């Protein structure tokens, strides 16, 4: 936290990250599924069920 | 006894070559009669390269408005090898001379490319009787029917659709080089006698015929045919307010193919499914 999230040039863009990686995990996870559970996705993405729907 | 396609008459060929009747009218040649051996060897060479491209020469003669092809020999390939192999045409004992060249389009439809049309222009300019065959190996393998590509071109500085399946890539090349060549109606001739007798080896298969799996083998072919028929009919309507006859003929052939497939399926169902019920 004191080596990455310190300067404003990286703290501001930390929001763009932790979302692209979550998108790539989500895309690969739903690849072999025809019907998947949203709460199941939340436990894999480590985010809330409401946030899964927004993503 | 019909036949009469063989027995190369030298005097008539020299007379028709010296007369040069195709110089006056540009649309002289309209019918291309490929032989059984020509097709067999052409398709075998086309499939003997897989996705790679093959090319060779095809020998034959000219009679009136028809161009008859009797034989075809492959080529090793642009280097000296092809030119050295070209001497085969005059080295063997055969009176058919050379009439054109065939080359394969593995998965790129049947049209003529820009370099292809330029080579055909040159060949027609300095070798008057010449035709280009653009058969497709992948399509005949997948659909089970041979698609022909007799595509004689127009002369330079002169001004006067069927296999439109190229999805994205080469369709641009199709559009620019489209009015530079005109297709030839391909009408196959069987020598009868010996070959008609020996065609019983087809009957020896008897299993691919009894289980043909039609109507799904060439489903994309029929969808493309209907797609072409749609704007053929739209052009017929625009002219009307005879292209309508051509559109009707195309619809009749497509429908006949579909009903033939259905008849085969019904025959198979009666033969196999309706037994021991």
């Amino acid at each position: 936290h004191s080596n990455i999230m310190d300067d404003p040039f990286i703290r501001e863009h930390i929001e763009e990250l932790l979302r692209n990686i979550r998108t790539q995990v989500l895309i690969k996870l739903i690849k072999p599924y025809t019907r998947i559970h949203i709460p199941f996705i939340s436990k894999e993405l480590n985010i809330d069920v409401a946030d899964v729907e927004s993503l | 006894s019909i036949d009469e396609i063989y027995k190369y008459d030298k005097k008539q060929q020299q007379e028709i070559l010296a007369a040069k009747p195709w110089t006056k009218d540009h649309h002289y040649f309209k019918y291309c009669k490929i032989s059984a051996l020509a097709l067999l060897k052409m398709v075998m060479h086309a499939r003997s390269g897989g996705n790679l491209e093959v090319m060779g020469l095809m020998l034959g003669k000219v009679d009136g408005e028809t161009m008859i092809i009797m034989d075809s020999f492959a080529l090793p390939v642009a280097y000296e090898y092809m030119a050295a192999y070209i001497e085969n045409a005059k080295q063997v004992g055969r009176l058919e001379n050379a009439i054109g060249w065939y080359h394969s389009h593995p998965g790129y439809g049947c049209w003529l490319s820009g370099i292809d049309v330029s080579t055909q222009m040159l060949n027609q300019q300095f070798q008057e009787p010449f035709v280009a065959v653009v058969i497709d190996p992948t399509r005949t393998i997948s659909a089970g029917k041979v698609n022909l590509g007799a595509f004689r071109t127009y002369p330079k500085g002169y001004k006067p659709s069927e296999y439109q399946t190229i999805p994205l890539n080469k369709i641009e090349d199709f559009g620019v080089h489209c009015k530079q060549y005109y297709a030839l109606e391909v009408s196959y001739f069987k020598s009868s006698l010996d070959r008609k007798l020996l065609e019983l080896l087809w009957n020896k298969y008897w299993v691919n015929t009894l289980s043909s799996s039609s109507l799904l083998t060439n489903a994309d072919y029929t969808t493309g045919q209907v797609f072409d028929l749609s704007e053929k009919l739209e052009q017929s309507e625009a002219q009307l307010g005879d292209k309508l006859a051509k559109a009707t003929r195309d619809s009749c052939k497509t429908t006949i193919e579909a009903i033939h497939g259905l008849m085969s399926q019904v025959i198979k169902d009666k033969l196999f499914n309706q037994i021991n019920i």
């Binding site: - | 005949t140 020996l198 019983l200």
Partner: protein, 275 residues
């Protein structure tokens, strides 16, 4: 396989075209000599595309013009990387002493030569049987080698199959009849096979042939397999296909009716209302 000979249908068409061209050129039928090439895998023949090898047929004797074949060797090697000389073909009936002499000449080039004798004047149903090749019989004194016929197979690739199907009757005699004759022939030969199997079963039942416990078991399995795909999903798919073809026929009967109506109105506009 017991003798591992596999002929390709392209060779037969090659020989037929050669014979027909020579017959037309010289007026009368004439004996021809060729050269079968192919791939050898120890015990495999696998004949493929053949070339002319005209040689000579002078009077009653065949001269050794095989230098032309030697020149053709490097020529055909340029387009056929994995193909080598295997034998030669001819047109005629039973083997002749001239065939023996030509075979002796050919054995100079290759150690294991074949001898195809495609007969074009045959008038009997089954195809002329290709090659009568031999292992060469040796006896004390003169060799006096003969030919010991061994069986052949008609293995073919997919491109050859499609080409042969296209040359065969497929789409004055109407397209319906041409399409139906192929099915008639296929069903006829299948019916002949099934009828002969039934005849064997009846013969075993009566007692003409010895009871083979395995042939009748295979026949029982074949009978049990006879109702092919009788599922409810197969019926649904078949009815879907039939309905699709019916709609495709309706669209096109409509087109033909429109064309005929257009012709009728064209003829009607120049007969009654002259404007």
């Amino acid at each position: 396989g017991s003798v591992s000979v596999a002929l390709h249908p392209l060779v037969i068409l090659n020989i037929s075209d050669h014979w027909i061209r020579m017959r037309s050129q010289e007026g009368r039928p004439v004996q021809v000599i060729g050269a079968l090439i192919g791939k050898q895998e120890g015990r495999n023949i696998e004949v493929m595309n053949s070339f002319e090898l005209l040689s000579h047929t002078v009077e009653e004797k065949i001269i050794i013009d095989k230098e032309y074949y030697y020149t053709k060797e490097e020529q055909f090697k340029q387009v056929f990387k994995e193909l080598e000389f295997l034998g030669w073909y001819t047109t005629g009936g039973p083997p002749d002493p001239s065939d023996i002499h030509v075979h002796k000449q050919v054995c100079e080039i290759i150690e294991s030569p074949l001898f195809l004798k495609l007969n074009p004047m045959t008038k009997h149903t089954d195809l002329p049987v290709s090659v009568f090749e031999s292992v060469i019989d040796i006896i004390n004194g003169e060799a006096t080698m003969l030919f010991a016929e061994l069986t052949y197979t008609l293995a073919t690739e997919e491109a050859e199959r499609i080409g042969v199907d296209h040359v065969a009757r497929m789409t004055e005699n109407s397209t319906v009849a041409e399409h139906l004759i192929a099915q008639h022939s296929a069903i006829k030969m299948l019916h002949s096979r099934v009828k002969l199997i039934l005849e064997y079963v009846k013969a075993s039942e009566a007692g003409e042939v010895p009871f083979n416990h395995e042939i009748l078991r295979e026949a029982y399995a074949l009978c049990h397999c006879l109702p092919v795909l009788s599922t409810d999903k197969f019926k649904t798919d078949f009815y879907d296909q039939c309905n699709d073809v019916g709609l495709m026929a309706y669209l096109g009967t409509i087109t033909k009716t429109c064309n005929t109506m257009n012709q009728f109105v064209n003829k009607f506009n120049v007969l009654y209302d002259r404007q």
